[PDB]
Motif scaffolding. Sequence first.
Motif, mmCIF file in Angstrom:
data_model
loop_
_atom_site.group_PDB
_atom_site.id
_atom_site.type_symbol
_atom_site.label_atom_id
_atom_site.label_comp_id
_atom_site.label_asym_id
_atom_site.label_seq_id
_atom_site.Cartn_x
_atom_site.Cartn_y
_atom_site.Cartn_z
ATOM 1 N N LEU A 42 42.377 51.861 61.516
ATOM 2 C CA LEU A 42 42.658 53.142 60.883
ATOM 3 C C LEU A 42 41.740 54.248 61.381
ATOM 4 C CD1 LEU A 42 45.068 52.812 59.007
ATOM 5 C CD2 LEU A 42 43.591 50.817 58.572
ATOM 6 N N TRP A 132 38.680 29.341 35.844
ATOM 7 C CA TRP A 132 39.370 30.616 35.721
ATOM 8 C C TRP A 132 40.283 30.796 36.924
ATOM 9 C CZ3 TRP A 132 34.519 34.166 34.574
ATOM 10 C CH2 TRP A 132 33.965 33.780 33.351
ATOM 11 N N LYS A 133 41.534 31.157 36.673
ATOM 12 C CA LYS A 133 42.511 31.353 37.731
ATOM 13 C C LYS A 133 42.739 32.841 37.939
ATOM 14 C CE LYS A 133 44.207 28.447 39.566
ATOM 15 N NZ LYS A 133 43.718 27.726 40.771
ATOM 16 N N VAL A 134 42.586 33.295 39.179
ATOM 17 C CA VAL A 134 42.936 34.670 39.520
ATOM 18 C C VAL A 134 44.357 34.760 40.072
ATOM 19 C CG1 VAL A 134 41.619 34.378 41.689
ATOM 20 C CG2 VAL A 134 42.260 36.670 40.925
ATOM 21 N N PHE A 135 44.764 33.821 40.926
ATOM 22 C CA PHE A 135 46.154 33.706 41.363
ATOM 23 C C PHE A 135 46.784 32.567 40.567
ATOM 24 C CE2 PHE A 135 45.149 35.562 45.818
ATOM 25 C CZ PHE A 135 45.173 36.833 45.285
ATOM 26 N N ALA A 136 47.070 32.841 39.300
ATOM 27 C CA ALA A 136 47.515 31.798 38.387
ATOM 28 C C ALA A 136 48.989 31.486 38.596
ATOM 29 C CB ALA A 136 47.269 32.211 36.939
ATOM 30 N N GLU A 137 49.300 30.197 38.674
ATOM 31 C CA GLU A 137 50.673 29.742 38.817
ATOM 32 C C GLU A 137 51.463 30.064 37.551
ATOM 33 O OE1 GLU A 137 51.899 28.355 41.605
ATOM 34 O OE2 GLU A 137 53.908 28.012 40.791
ATOM 35 N N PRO A 138 52.715 30.508 37.681
ATOM 36 C CA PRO A 138 53.551 30.763 36.498
ATOM 37 C C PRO A 138 53.860 29.475 35.751
ATOM 38 C CG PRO A 138 54.379 31.958 38.390
ATOM 39 C CD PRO A 138 53.339 31.024 38.910
ATOM 40 N N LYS A 139 53.494 29.437 34.472
ATOM 41 C CA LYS A 139 53.781 28.284 33.633
ATOM 42 C C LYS A 139 54.855 28.540 32.590
ATOM 43 C CE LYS A 139 50.773 27.008 30.451
ATOM 44 N NZ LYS A 139 51.429 27.421 29.181
ATOM 45 N N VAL A 140 54.982 29.762 32.076
ATOM 46 C CA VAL A 140 55.996 30.053 31.069
ATOM 47 C C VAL A 140 56.982 31.080 31.603
ATOM 48 C CG1 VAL A 140 54.392 29.542 29.187
ATOM 49 C CG2 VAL A 140 54.734 31.903 29.929
ATOM 50 N N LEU C 151 53.345 33.183 45.721
ATOM 51 C CA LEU C 151 52.587 33.802 44.638
ATOM 52 C C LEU C 151 51.425 34.624 45.170
ATOM 53 C CD1 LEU C 151 52.152 33.879 41.469
ATOM 54 C CD2 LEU C 151 50.610 31.957 41.853
ATOM 55 N N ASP C 152 50.670 34.051 46.111
ATOM 56 C CA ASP C 152 49.455 34.684 46.607
ATOM 57 C C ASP C 152 49.770 35.949 47.387
ATOM 58 O OD1 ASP C 152 48.061 32.560 45.493
ATOM 59 O OD2 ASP C 152 48.083 31.408 47.354
ATOM 60 N N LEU C 155 50.970 38.713 44.865
ATOM 61 C CA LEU C 155 49.857 39.196 44.056
ATOM 62 C C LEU C 155 48.835 39.963 44.881
ATOM 63 C CD1 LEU C 155 49.226 36.260 41.560
ATOM 64 C CD2 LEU C 155 50.271 38.490 41.114
ATOM 65 N N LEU C 195 56.874 37.284 39.374
ATOM 66 C CA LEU C 195 57.057 35.846 39.283
ATOM 67 C C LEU C 195 56.778 35.303 37.892
ATOM 68 C CD1 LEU C 195 55.596 34.716 42.669
ATOM 69 C CD2 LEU C 195 57.895 35.345 42.086
ATOM 70 N N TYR C 196 56.174 36.094 37.010
ATOM 71 C CA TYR C 196 55.872 35.621 35.669
ATOM 72 C C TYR C 196 57.011 35.924 34.705
ATOM 73 C CZ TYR C 196 51.200 35.260 37.619
ATOM 74 O OH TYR C 196 50.117 34.930 38.395
ATOM 75 N N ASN C 273 50.595 33.085 30.953
ATOM 76 C CA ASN C 273 50.494 32.263 32.144
ATOM 77 C C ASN C 273 49.054 32.043 32.576
ATOM 78 O OD1 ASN C 273 53.289 31.643 32.882
ATOM 79 N ND2 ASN C 273 53.499 33.869 32.957
ATOM 80 N N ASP C 274 48.105 32.232 31.655
ATOM 81 C CA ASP C 274 46.688 31.889 31.812
ATOM 82 C C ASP C 274 46.017 32.642 32.955
ATOM 83 O OD1 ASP C 274 46.644 30.179 29.620
ATOM 84 O OD2 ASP C 274 47.239 28.446 30.824
ATOM 85 N N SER C 275 46.443 33.870 33.207
ATOM 86 C CA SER C 275 45.735 34.767 34.109
ATOM 87 C C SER C 275 45.077 35.837 33.254
ATOM 88 C CB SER C 275 46.675 35.381 35.141
ATOM 89 O OG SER C 275 47.631 36.204 34.516
ATOM 90 N N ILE C 277 41.604 37.325 34.375
ATOM 91 C CA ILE C 277 40.859 38.190 35.284
ATOM 92 C C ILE C 277 41.790 39.186 35.954
ATOM 93 C CG2 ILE C 277 39.413 38.186 37.363
ATOM 94 C CD1 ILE C 277 38.477 35.414 36.541
ATOM 95 N N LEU C 278 42.991 38.731 36.319
ATOM 96 C CA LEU C 278 43.891 39.580 37.096
ATOM 97 C C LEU C 278 44.456 40.757 36.301
ATOM 98 C CD1 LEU C 278 44.816 39.848 39.861
ATOM 99 C CD2 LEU C 278 46.854 38.552 39.365
#
Lengths: 140, 105, 347, 169, 120, 171, 80, 98, 110
Positions: A42, A132-140, C151-152, C155, C195-196, C273-275, C277-278
Amino acid sequence: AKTLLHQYWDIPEGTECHRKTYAATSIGGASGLVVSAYSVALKTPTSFLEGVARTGRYTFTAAAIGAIFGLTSCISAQVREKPDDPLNYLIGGCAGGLTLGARTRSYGIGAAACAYMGLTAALVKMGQLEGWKVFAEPKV
Amino acid sequence: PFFDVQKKLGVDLDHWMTIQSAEQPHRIPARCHAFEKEWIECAHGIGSIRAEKECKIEFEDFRECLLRQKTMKRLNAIKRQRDKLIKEGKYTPPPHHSGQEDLRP
Amino acid sequence: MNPIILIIILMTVMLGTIIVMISTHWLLIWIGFEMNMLAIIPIMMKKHNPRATEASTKYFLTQSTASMLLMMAIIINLMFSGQWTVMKLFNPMASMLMTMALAMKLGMAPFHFWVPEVTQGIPLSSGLILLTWQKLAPMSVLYQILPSINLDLILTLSILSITIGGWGGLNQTQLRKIMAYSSIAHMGWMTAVLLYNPTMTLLNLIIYIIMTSTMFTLFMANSTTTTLSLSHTWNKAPIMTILVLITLLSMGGLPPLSGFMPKWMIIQEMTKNDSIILPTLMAITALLNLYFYMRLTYSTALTMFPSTNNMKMKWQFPTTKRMTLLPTMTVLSTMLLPLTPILSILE
Amino acid sequence: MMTYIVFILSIIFVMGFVGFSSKPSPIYGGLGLIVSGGVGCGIVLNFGGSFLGLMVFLIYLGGMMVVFGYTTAMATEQYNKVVLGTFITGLLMEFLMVYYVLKDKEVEIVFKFNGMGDWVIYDTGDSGFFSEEAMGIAALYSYGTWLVIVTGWSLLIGVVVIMEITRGN
Amino acid sequence: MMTGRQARAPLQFLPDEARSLPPPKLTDPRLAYIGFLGYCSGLIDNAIRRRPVLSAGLHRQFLYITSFVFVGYYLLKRQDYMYAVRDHDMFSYIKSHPEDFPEKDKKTYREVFEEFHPVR
Amino acid sequence: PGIVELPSLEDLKVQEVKVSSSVLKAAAHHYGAQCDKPNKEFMLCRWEEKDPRRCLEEGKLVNQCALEFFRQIKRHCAEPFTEYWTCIDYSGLQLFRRCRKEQAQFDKCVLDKLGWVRPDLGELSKVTKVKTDRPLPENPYHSRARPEPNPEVEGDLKPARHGSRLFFWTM
Amino acid sequence: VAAFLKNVWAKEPVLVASFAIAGLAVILPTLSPYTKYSLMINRATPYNYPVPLRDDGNMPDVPSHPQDPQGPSLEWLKRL
Amino acid sequence: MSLVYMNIMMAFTVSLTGLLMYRSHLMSSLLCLEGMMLSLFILATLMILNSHFTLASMMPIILLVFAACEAALGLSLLVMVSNTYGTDYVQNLNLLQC
Amino acid sequence: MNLMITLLTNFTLATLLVTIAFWLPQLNVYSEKTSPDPMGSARLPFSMKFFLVAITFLLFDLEIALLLPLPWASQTTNLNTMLTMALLLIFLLAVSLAYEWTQKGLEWTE
Ligand SMILES: CCCCCCCCCCCCCCCCCC(=O)OC[C@H](COP(=O)([O-])OC[C@H](O)COP(=O)([O-])OC[C@H](COC(=O)CCCCCCCCCCCCCCCCC)OC(=O)CCCCCCCCCCCCCCCCC)OC(=O)CCCCCCCCCCCCCCCCC
């Protein structure tokens, strides 16, 4: 560079100082190359030599931050004998902040980087501990 | 927002080019017509999450029909071992794999 | 432009977005994006100055690159699946290429670098079309391929869009660049929850389009493109300062306003979905967007910048501009939070 | 060698793109893309895509690249190390790909790739008294009705759009 | 989330089973709030064109109120329908999978031991 | 996976029809008229079984019935048939229309000495019915068990218990 | 309407011939007695093999031989 | 997979990186974009011919026509830039930095 | 294969005659020439009208590309739809021509 972070976290704390220091050095070097690539993208350097000088400067700065972070964290966890303790990464993050301030040749940036990177490394240790998850997988 | 106008109105705007097993001009079959028919009739209506794990075998047969990666790998193995045994002198081709036999029909 | 030609071209823009929305074949998706770009180029070149030609050239190059990456993702899907249904993709490489293509078409960071230029180069109405109508088709394709979106990647695009759209608007004085960096940050918010729960993605898109259309309608009704000309509005029309006040406080997500509605619901779907920090760092970064909104409200409604003498002539004329749906969009962008459970109509 | 010919054409095809991706000038770039269009057309023709190959000639080359060369001729007034270095770089990358997949009969850049000739994956039957590709293109008027509507509307809109933005008023 | 439920009958705003649900009353507080939004839209429309805000265009204000009440009635019908579909699918899934939803033994506090933490 | 089952080379031995394509094209209409039944049995078995390995014997019957077709030409009408397929054989597209008088002589000799009527325009393209004794394949695609569908919706739709249940909203 | 026709036929006879030929091409296939036969000939052309039916026992309209009386005939095409 | 598909994908990536690294001319960018389109045509064509998927044979022609129409639009944009600065240099398109 | 032989023979004959035409008078040693245009040194003026007729060619050529499968399309069994869409494509080419006409796009190269 997903395996870089894994081979950083695979070694237990205060056990093998050299490969922890090298893994954090390599992670810092990768991050410095990313910053260098976007920086010469840039903002065009005036020459190829100026461009590789900016690249080597940012890469060596971030690699030295990572090296002194991993060294200070592992030595603190050795002499304190507390591996699962975020105060070790607090001291390591402040050491990396003093390293960034010495690379930027300034003390105010050094104290700011000490405080914020020490809190950041403490938060990363606590996220490693309590999951702690920052890129948390979708569970619900 | 997939506003499903084609099913609401009952029109076929683009479903006809969507799969290989659909109605074709002069009833020309695709080279993987049967495998795609099996994968669709397995995976139909049960949802995609259940389709990824309850219909994996027909999908693997259909992907291996499409790309022939296992078939090309097997032919690589046979042809490589064959040329290795030619190089070692332990194998000779038959007359019907050299072109000396006046083919069938 | 001839009004008949303008109507046919705008119906072609709408027809391109509709063909993206309603079709079941990937070729018709690509065709709808091609038709949309092909028709929206003259809307950007409406006034025929070098800035609109530069903006249309940059828009053409980025959308053409995105269309070619989209077709390569489609063609790789045809390799690994033999079919053409607009659904999940059957290869992570095709998923990555289509996510990159749609992030370019939305102008999400780090493919954001065309959005503040092109919006500055075009008029306010075509900027309204670009920042509201041109989001609907790529968000629809993202809505239909979310079983295959990594996902990554999405996000990273989301947080990079929120942070870059936060820091970008802090240095700005042009209103179109402010709305463009606001666009980048809001697209980050929309894809962070894709995705959530994609219903909250649709919610954030609708509330964003209402608030953006309100702000561009106010900018057209006052003929204002800079901050410093928006600061003359209190001496010309004091109601418009109250309207931009409540709408800029709503776009910052301050409760009890309607723009608090999406992001709160987004947090409400990211902690299930237990996030933790994000959405926390997302909401902390939204304070930057709030800060340059507060800068505009200080310049426009809460203080009185000095005017000129010729404003006294403009007192003798009322606004004859067709302020289409401006009270409706003003109400629906501020007083909508007590109707927050209406979002189930988007399920 | 002649059993690999389509692959060989593809190699020239990739070399042709390194002809113009290095961007010496838009005129030599147009020439490289014309040669690339001819050899990619030959790739298409050697699978049985006769009509699609002659669309590469008639519509892509004879129709569109003529307009590219025509527009280029009305710019860039008639009278590098970067072009030379990028050209030899792309040349060496492609021939290293060639050397790897020919000595190994397998390579993996992003996907796995077989190293045999691409003749292996064809079909061993006939189509009777038609070309399948010809009948599938002829079904644009029987089965492709919506596709014809949106394509013709896009071309009409394209005429209108070019006459709008080139007018300057 | 519920994208497969409203896909066998696509693009139906209110399906037929929505008629099994009680409609919102005409004295719904949500519907009266949407009518208030219409009244505020009428006031903003008089304010931006510099009309007398409460007096001018009573036909226009009344059409604002009428249009928002009319649209909001159907929006509330769809809202109630979608939360009804949500609970219906929830309850049918709980009934169809008892191995995942066990009936938990509610212990009384005479058996439940909690640690005491003194404030001193 | 499993081993594919190829038949032996003895199961593929049959007396071949070693004539050229112009010989076959000259005799084609009488071949479709006379060799109807085993040809249609074979093609019914071929579209039903979807496997040539399940269709060998009927195929051999085709190669048995073609040869008996040609011998019955070779015994009686070798001269007009030879003079007709030579003229068919001259043309690069093998036109029937270039050879109508040799066709008329071959049809005259065949209808006199064998009673075969050449099929009219439309007849050999008819869809015919075939009475076989082999069974219908119950699973010609060798398809395994299909997955059970998801349970459908049933029950009258009751209102939402306490409305939306969104945080503090009572409706 | 008759003066307009002679006027445009004197000024622009190329466009008059163009719109006349185009109008005939539009309306005339819907007025011709032979347009049915184009469809009948295109469906009488056997590009594919006529895959036979398994005889269940009750198909009186499906022949057993090509030279059987039942089935679709093409005497309409031989005569026309 | 098939070895020719490697070369057609690699050609698409070569024309991509040419389109993603400008030198000076906008016409060279348009040529890289049309090289991308050509490689997409070739790859789609080889798959559709290879699979005997009959109805998708009209697909590459459509992929040609639209994109060539797109190319025409791009040429017009270049000409308008060329009617402003005399050349088609992309460094003249920098007014929107401020 | 015969086509590749024929193309190679045509290209080889053309390259041979071009090499002969470029190097047969080079054998002559005539003289070295010094020799120190209607436009003097002026830059090539762009004309919008040549670009408009070239783009109009490209757009009608894409419409021609759509029209090219018609002799095969007439063989279909959906003849009403085929005839409707064929007349519709030729009509859209005609409407593109009429819009190019009536908005003065075909002027001074009419
Ligand atoms: C024989 C056949 C005919 C029979 C007829 C029978 C009826 C005869 C009378 C006819 C009139 C009936 C009116 C509706 C029923 C009563 C509704 C009610 O009071 O709900 C209490 C409602 C809930 O309290 P509650 O004690 O649990 O429930 C009592 C009932 O059981 C409530 O019943 P519920 O539990 O079934 O209510 C359902 C649910 C109950 O609520 C909930 O479940 C909780 C959620 C409520 C929304 C919270 C949002 C918070 C964030 C936004 C805050 C916005 C700023 C606040 C206001 C700023 C200034 C405008 O409602 C909602 O969620 C709808 C939202 C609230 C709308 C209420 C109706 C407003 C109509 C007129 C609007 C005028 C402007 C009002 C102010 C704007 C804000 C509403 O109270 C609040 O939420 C507090 C705010 C007050 C709301 C408006 C009160 C209505 C009367 C306004 C007159 C004064 C206007 C002054 C001028 C304009 C403003 C400056």
